[PDB]
Amino acid sequence: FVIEKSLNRIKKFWKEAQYEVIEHSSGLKLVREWDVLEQACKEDLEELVSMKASNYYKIFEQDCLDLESKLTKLSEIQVNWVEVQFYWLDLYGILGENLDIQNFLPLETSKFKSLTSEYKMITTRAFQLDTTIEVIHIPNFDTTLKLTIDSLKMIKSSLSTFLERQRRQFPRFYFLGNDDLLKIIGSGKHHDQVSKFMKKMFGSIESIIFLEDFITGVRSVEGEVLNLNEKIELKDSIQAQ
Amino acid sequence: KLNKSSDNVKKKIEALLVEYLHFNNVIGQLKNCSTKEEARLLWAKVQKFYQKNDTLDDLNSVFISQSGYLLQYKFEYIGIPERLIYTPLLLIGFATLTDSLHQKYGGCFFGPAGTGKTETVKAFGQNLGRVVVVFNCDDSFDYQVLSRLLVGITQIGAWGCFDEFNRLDEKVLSAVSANIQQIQNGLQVGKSHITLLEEETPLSPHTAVFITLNPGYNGRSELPENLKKSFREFSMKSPQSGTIAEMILQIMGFEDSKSLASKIVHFLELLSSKCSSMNHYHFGLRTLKGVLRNCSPLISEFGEGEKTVVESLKRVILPSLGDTDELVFKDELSKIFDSAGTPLNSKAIVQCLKDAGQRSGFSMSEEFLKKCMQFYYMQKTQQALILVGKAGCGKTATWKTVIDAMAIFDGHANVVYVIDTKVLTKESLYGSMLKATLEWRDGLFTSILRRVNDDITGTFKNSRIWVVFDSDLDPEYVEAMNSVLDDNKILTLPNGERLPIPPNFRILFETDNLDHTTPATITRCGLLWFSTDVCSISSKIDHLLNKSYEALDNKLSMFELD
Amino acid sequence: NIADVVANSENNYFTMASERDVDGTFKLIELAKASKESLKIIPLGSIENLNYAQEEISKSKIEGGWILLQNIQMSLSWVKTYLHKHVEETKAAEEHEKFKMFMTCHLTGDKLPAPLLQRTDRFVYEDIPGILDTVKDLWGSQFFTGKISGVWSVYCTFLLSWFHALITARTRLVPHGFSKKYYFNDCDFQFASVYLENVLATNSTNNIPWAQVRDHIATIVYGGKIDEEKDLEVVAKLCA
Ligand SMILES: Nc1ncnc2c1ncn2[C@@H]1O[C@H](COP(=O)(O)OP(=O)(O)OP(=O)(O)O)[C@@H](O)[C@H]1O
Ligand SMILES: Nc1ncnc2c1ncn2[C@@H]1O[C@H](COP(=O)(O)OP(=O)(O)O)[C@@H](O)[C@H]1O
Ligand SMILES: [Mg+2]
16 A cells, blocks of 8 residues: 555546646637646656556556556647747747738748647647646647647747848847847837837947938937938838848 | 037037147147157157048048058947047057057957056047947856857947956857957958858958956956967056046146146045055046046036035045044045035035934934935935945934935935845846746836836826835845946846836945945945944933833823823 | 987877977977878867867878877867867777877966876977077078068068067066066067068158157067066167
8 A cells, every 4th residue: 555545646636737827818828837747747757667666566557557658648748838838929929919020921920820720729629628637638639739839940940040131131230139129120110119229239329310201310328419411211111121 | 618518519528628638738749859750759659540532432531540550430420428538558558459450460458457448448449430349248148149249240340349358157258269269360361251150141351359358366367378369468557547637627627637636646546555455445547537527516516626626535435434544534635635624505404414313313413414414415426325334333324314304305205115135036026037928027126116117196206216225235136236226227127128217216225244245336336334333322322212202102191201 | 309208108199298488399390200201280279270170180090190289278178078088089099090199288278187198198398499599590480481571671570580589588587587477479579570561661761760669669569468667668678
C-alpha cells in the first residue's frame, strides 16, 4: 500500500486538475499559470519512473504503464500548447490590431486569421472537457498544435524579414526597437505620432512641425525651430519610410 | 544683447559666446607671439574651418583643418547643444581625434572619471556638424541592441561613442569587441560591405567608433588586446578648471570673473584636500559646473557679485557635508572668500517653518532650522532628494515640517505617499507582467504616477506630490527609476508604455546608509546629510510630553489634564 | 637558442613567449628557412582570420608543414574552445604526419590554460637588440615599399627612426628613463612618419616646420599613451 497510495494520489490529482482560463478580447480562451500543471506532470512522471525501481512494481505495473503513457502524452501536448499560445499572443500584438500593418502584409494577415480560427475551434473543443488530462483523448490534438506552431513561427520569420527590409530602406530605423518601428509603420494616416521617436532616431531633433499636410520643419530638444526650404507634402498613401 | 533677450535666443547667444571667447583667446595668443614661426605653430593647433569654392557639391563644400589634417563637415542638425569651453586640453583632444580619424583608426580616451572624455567626444562631433550617438555601457544594456545600433551606425555613417567601455560583462565585451574590430578593419581596408549580425550590410566610409575608458579597480583600464591595434589611446589630463570657470562666469555676467574663478577652483581643491574622504564627496569639475549653474537663479535675489557665488556654494556644497567638515567648509569660505553671511528671501519662509514646527510640537533649535532651510532650498532645484543620517536624526521630522511650511507659504496642497521601498518586491512596486497572458499589472509607484498624470479630479495640478521611499535604498530598486532620476524624467516601464512625471512629482529617500548606492544616483539627486540629532535631549522630551498630553486630552477633563 | 630547444625536444608543440616590446617571429622565420621550411604565418584576429586559422591548422596537421600562431593573448576565447581541445585530441602528433606548432604569447599577457602549457614545450625570447640594430632595422624596412615624396622625406624618416629607437631603448628602463613601462609599437612610428610626410608636402621643401613637428610628435603621437608629466617632459626634451 505504500506504493498503492502514491498511485491513487496521482490518479486523484489528475482527475481534478484543470487549467485556469481568462477570456480574450478576440474571443480566444487564454490559459493562465502554465507552470503548475506542467511541473505536476513532470514530477508525477519522475515518481512513476522511480516506482519501477522497487521490486513491488509487478503488482501495479499495468496501472503504472497506463499512467506513464497518459502523462507522456500530456507532456507532449503541454510543451507545444504553451508555446503555441505564446507565439499567437505575440503575433496578435502585431497583426489584427492595426489595419495599416494588415494592408502591408495581406498573406501573413490571412494566414494568421485562419490560424486564429483553427486555434479557437481547438481550444473551445478542449475546454468543454473540464479536465486537462482528458485533452489527450481529443483526436489529432497534438498534430494540430504542431501545425499551428509551425505556421506561427513561419509567419514570425516573414515578419522579421519584412522589418529588416524596412530598416534597410531607412537606416535610421535601426535606432528604434521592433515595437517602435511597428508603431511608426502602422501610423499610416496619422503620420504625427512618428515625432515621438525623432529624439530616438534623429538625435537632436525632438519632434516635427506639421502644417495642414505639409512638414514646415522640425524642432530640437532645446525648442529651437528649424524651417525647411521646401515643405514636404504628405499623402495618405505615402509610406513613412 | 544677452540681458535683453528671450530664453530661446538667450540659449543661442550663450552658446555663441563660448566660440567668440575662444576666438578672442586665440587672437590674443597670436598677438603676443614674438615670432612668425611661433604664430604659425599656435595657429596650426587651433581648429580652423574652410569653405571650398571649386567643388560644386554643396554638402561637402566645408571642411575642417587642424594640424594639417582635413575633415569634412556633415550638415546634420545639432540644435543648440551645451557648448564646451575651448580649453587647451580640449584642442589637444580634438587634434588627437583628428589624427586618429585621418588614418581611419578609432579614437580612445582614458583617464580618471570627470576629466571630460565623453563630453570632448560629443563636442568634437558637434564641431563637425555630426550628432555622436552614445552607447551607455552596463546600463540595462544587452548585446542584441548593440548589434542593431552598430548596424545602424555603419549603414547611416554616423559616429559612435562607447561611454564607460570598461564596465560591462565579459561575454558581451568580447562580442562587441569583435564587431568593432570588424567595423574598423572594414574602414581601414575600404571594403564596401562587412559581415556583422550574421549578415552582410553596407559600410559607409564616414563611420567612426570612439571609446572612453574610465579607470578600473587596479588603475588605468585598457582596451582588449584585439582592439589595441585598431585604436589610438589618449590619456585625458586634469581639465583646465580655471579657464572653464572663468569663461562661464564671464558669460553669466559676473564682474571680476577671473578672480572669482580662481577663488572657486582654489576653494574646491582646498575642500578636496582638507575634508575627510567620503564616497559621496565630489568636488570635481561637475560639482563646480553645478555651483556655477546654480548661481543663475540667485542672480536676481543677490546680484552678479561674489556674494552670489558664496551663497550658491553654501546651497550646493554645504548640505552634503558632515559635522566635522562643516567647520572646515566655513573656515575655507571665510578665508578664500569674504561674505556678510546675510541670506535674503529667508524671512517669511522662516516664519512659516516656525509656525509649522510649533503646530507639530517640534522645537525650532539652531540645528533643526538649519536642516529645514537646507531642505527647503535644495528642493527648489533637484526633483529627487536623499536624506541620510542615523536612526533618530530627524529626517522625517525635517521633511514633514518643511512640507507643512511650504503648504502654508505657497498655498499649495501636499499629497504625501510614504512607501517602504524594501518591504515591497520590485514586481509589486513597479508592476509585473503575466508571461502566460500578457496582462500588465500597474503596481504601486506606477499606479500613483498614473493617478497624478491622469488627474481627473483636477487637484494634482494645483498641488505638490511627494513619494517618500522611507526604507533604505539599493541599486536594484533605483535602477528601475534611474530614467526618472535623469533629465528625461519619464518612468520607463519594462513594457506597456512610458509615464512622464510632472514637475510637481517629488521623490524623497529617507534612508540612513549610502554603502550600496552607485555614485550616479547620488550625483543625480540632491543629497542632504544629517550628522547630528536635529533637536536636543530635552526638546524631544518636551515634544513627546506634548504629544501624550494631546492624546489624553480627547478623553480627560480640562482641569484634571492641566 | 630556439634552434637547440626545437631540435633536441621530441614534442611537436612549442610556445615561444616574449615581452610585448619584442617579438621573435623573424627568429622563427630564420629557423624555418634553416630547415624543413614550410612555415605559414597565421595572424589571429577577426572571425575570418579565426576560421582561416582553424582550417589551416587542421590542414597542416595532415600535410605536415610548419605553422605559427601569433598573439594567442588576443584569441584566448578561440584557444580555450578550439586550440585546447584540438591539441588535446591530437596530442598523438606522431600518428599524424610530423608537423610543428608554434604559439607566440606574452609574459605580461593573460593567463593561458594549464593543460595546454604543461603539455607543450615552452620557450622564452629575450633577444633585445641594441639601439643601432633597431635603427638599422627601421631604416631597412622603410624603403622596401619604395619612395613616396622628395629627399627631405627620407631625411625625416631617418631622424624619426633614430628617435623611435631611442624611445624604445629608454622605455625598457624603470624608473630611470620612463617612470612607467610603456610600449611604443610600430603604429606610433607609422603615424609619426605620415605626419612628417604631410607636413613636408603641405608646407614647403624647407627646414621651417620643426617647431610644430616636435610638438605634434611629442604631445599626440608618442604622448597619447603617457599620463605622467615627467614622462611627457622626457619625450618632449628628446623630441627637442
Ligand atoms: N525639533 C524637535 N523637537 C523635538 N523632538 C524632535 C524634533 N525634531 C525631531 N524630533 C524627534 O525626533 C524624531 C523625528 O523623527 P525620526 O528622525 O525618528 O524619523 P525617521 O527619519 O522616519 O526615522 P529614522 O531616522 O529612525 O529612520 C521623533 O522622535 C521626534 O520626536
Ligand atoms: N572643456 C570643458 N569645458 C566645459 N566643461 C567641461 C569640459 N570638460 C569637461 N567638462 C565638464 O565635466 C563634466 C564631466 O565630464 P565627463 O565627460 O562626464 O567625464 P567622463 O567622460 O570622464 O565621464 C561634464 O558635465 C562637463 O560639463
Ligand atoms: Mg564620460
